[PDB]
Design a protein around this ligand. Structure first.
Ligand code: ATP
Ligand code: ATP
Ligand code: LYS
Lengths: 317, 314
């Protein structure tokens, strides 16, 4: 099996399993100019009719942080022309939105790259946005949430398809993306967060994963099976969660007595939703009010009390 | 708060949260001679009456692997004599046992160790075994499972109470254990197995975890919160998985019709229980029969066929 089919087989597999494209007609690619983006594009133009797409276009965002960005942008317009594709370029100063909004260069650009994409989508009439997220991004992300503290959501990471976003390379490993770009002799722009190990994701990618791989070289593959199991168990619990939530709220309060003899796993999913907080301690606080009567203060004036069959928000302040 | 009250309260909290001890009278301690063993022993002797324990004793296994072995065994007896405790000591040639049985060394020791402990437990009339596992073993354990492939079970790691085994320092960090020992002026044996990054556990312990704490210095406490959550979620899934295994398994079959209209999460759970295998692959091969005709060959004669309304065996 060659590098081409090794990627295309996984993309088709993903399509089967998740129905990545099932009616969408116009696709907008979150094109960065990077290998994964280039390979993402090469694969979609090769499957354009297979997916019954009417049009595939690029959308590049110039964060204006580095100097190369000016050059990265040139590559993208060129690439688009070599492909005879439509492309929308966007220029914004993260740094000047991440300063006048208290933001890390990163987070601020994320918001902006997306705003522009949502923009390009709803305005130009595209049905969805395709991203180049791949299996290693999911490994790093998942491991980050594990590090930062989390539950199933973080362990699952992002999904192959969520609302308006589609991630065709979800099953593909970075090395497979790399091998395919070389095999087909594609050109792209290098990785210049190439080792700014000061950022967690990058520390995980360059210093953690390589160690874990010294334990299990097929970590990514082994990692994928675990996510499939968890996604399902999560889906189920979240499903049961709504069952109980509604089985439980009255308007603006929660029925302690009914929720008191329900499974802990579920009580916690319910509280989490009632209060709009995922923090473990805040959850336990509110949970304690199920047996004990009284008050608990969470944060933005989120104060909850027990009437006595009920557990509500205090209206004060 | 001092290094002692710090650890003591976490043990009292684990006891309050899990009922570690609740009728046991004679505890046998899996005593390695290392810090954790030593702090475990010191905490049980101090909380003996509180837990209503009639006796606490030490069990030390000489793996015969390291050169200090003999010496350490001696320290162990002296540690016992010092606190006027019984000490049972087992010795076996792990090394050899592995070669005449096809076992690496991790497994060999493990096998003989626990075997030795269960024998003392029975021939000495002990109710349970107290191990010195701690939160950092848990964190190292769960990362090993996340690396080798796993589900909730692996992520959760060992539990505070599992059968005959007890783990009173489950909530305690290795750092707290080390401060405890210095504070109370305790003596212990050197862990000459830190090094060897060849051992995955140590590679995680020395290379992986350190990098993670540079992202979150509170990794262990944060990991614990995650475990508690995962545990109750896992409890609910297994319970719901029991109901379904009973609502669908009628004989040596599974009511496809009923099991096909239920949650994937559960299906796999039902399948896993039915076919006795747990790996993702077999379960999914078997799982397709709920939708496609045919039969499957998993292991040693483990083959299942799909009838019109039933997924039974051959
Ligand atoms: N300059 C860009 N213009 C448009 N889209 C981009 C650009 N950079 C990245 N993307 C899109 O976002 C995806 C993820 O990129 P990257 O991992 O660098 O962002 P992150 O912010 O680091 O990740 P996430 O997007 O997971 O936060 C890329 O694969 C691509 O689909
Ligand atoms: N030589 C020994 N004699 C008796 N008990 C021991 C000995 N070594 C270890 N133990 C017990 O086993 C527990 C776990 O030890 P450790 O985790 O270092 O070994 P492992 O091989 O990693 O064990 P597991 O695989 O059970 O974690 C120790 O806390 C102690 O209670
Ligand atoms: N260096 C640590 C660990 C030594 C081995 C402990 N069993 C200490 O002595 O505190």
């Amino acid at each position: 099996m060659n590098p081409e089919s090794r990627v295309i087989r996984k993309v088709l597999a993903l399509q089967n399993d998740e129905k990545i494209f099932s009616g969408e007609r116009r696709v907008l690619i979150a094109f960065s100019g990077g290998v994964d983006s280039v390979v993402l594009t090469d694969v979609l133009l090769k499957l354009k009719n297979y997916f019954s797409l009417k049009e595939v276009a690029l959308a590049h965002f110039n964060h204006m942080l580095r100097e190369s960005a000016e050059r990265d942008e040139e590559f993208c317009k060129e690439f688009a022309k070599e492909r005879n594709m439509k492309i929308f370029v966007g220029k914004e100063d993260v740094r000047a939105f991440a300063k006048e909004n208290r933001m890390s260069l990163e987070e601020a650009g994320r918001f902006l790259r997306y705003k522009f994409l949502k923009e390009i989508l709803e305005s130009e009439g595209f049905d969805c946005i395709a991203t180049a997220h791949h299996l290693n991004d999911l490994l790093e992300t998942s491991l980050l949430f594990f590090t930062r503290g989390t539950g199933l959501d973080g362990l699952i990471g992002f999904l192959p398809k969520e609302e308006v976003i589609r991630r065709p390379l979800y099953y593909v490993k970075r090395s497979e993306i790399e091998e395919y770009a070389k095999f087909k002799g594609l050109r792209w722009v290098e990785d210049e967060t190439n080792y700014e190990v000061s950022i967690p994701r990058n520390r995980i990618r360059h210093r953690v994963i390589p160690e874990l791989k010294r334990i299990n070289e097929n970590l990514e593959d082994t990692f994928l099976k675990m996510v499939k199991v968890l996604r399902a168990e999560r889906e189920f619990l979240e499903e049961e969660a709504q069952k109980l939530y509604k089985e439980v709220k009255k308007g603006n309060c929660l029925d302690v007595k009914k929720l008191k003899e329900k499974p802990l796993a579920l009580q916690r999913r319910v509280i989490r939703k009632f209060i709009g907080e995922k923090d473990y301690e805040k959850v336990e606080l509110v949970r304690s009010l199920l047996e004990k009567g009284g008050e608990v203060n969470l944060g933005k004036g989120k104060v909850l009390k027990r009437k006595e069959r009920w557990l509500c928000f205090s209206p004060e302040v």
